[PDB]
Design a binder for this molecule. Sequence first.
Ligand SMILES: [Mn+2]
Length: 155
Amino acid sequence: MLKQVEIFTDGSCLGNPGPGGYGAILRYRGREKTFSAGYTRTTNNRMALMAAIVALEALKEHCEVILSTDSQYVRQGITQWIHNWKARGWKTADKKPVKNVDLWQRLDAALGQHQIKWEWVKGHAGHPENERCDELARAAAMNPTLEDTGYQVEV
Ligand SMILES: [Mn+2]
């Protein structure tokens, strides 16, 4: 046994690409930490990844994380793509670089640092914390202050 800890994440974007933001909550024995930031030009998908990355990298020790998210991108990625990417060296079946590789690798590095337990939020049947993350992301998307320099503009 290590350390329980619960993490709720959410990403949001006003366009594609466009101003976006992420929301994330880190909870440990009642204690709760909040993460949030907005970017001038990004995508929903990158914001979903960021949320998870920020919360995870905030852990100063190996934990038993319960990562809750309603992002269809992260799910379909963790349960459909991730495994293959590691086998082909982060390249598409066509020997082509994968999209958002910068955040996917960052996410995977932080993941193996703990014992992750994914909880996919279905028909918005999420907890208040997931709603809170949604609010933080939307608020941040409407008030962008940084740039997502990792995003390769597809205009
Ligand atoms: Mn949302």
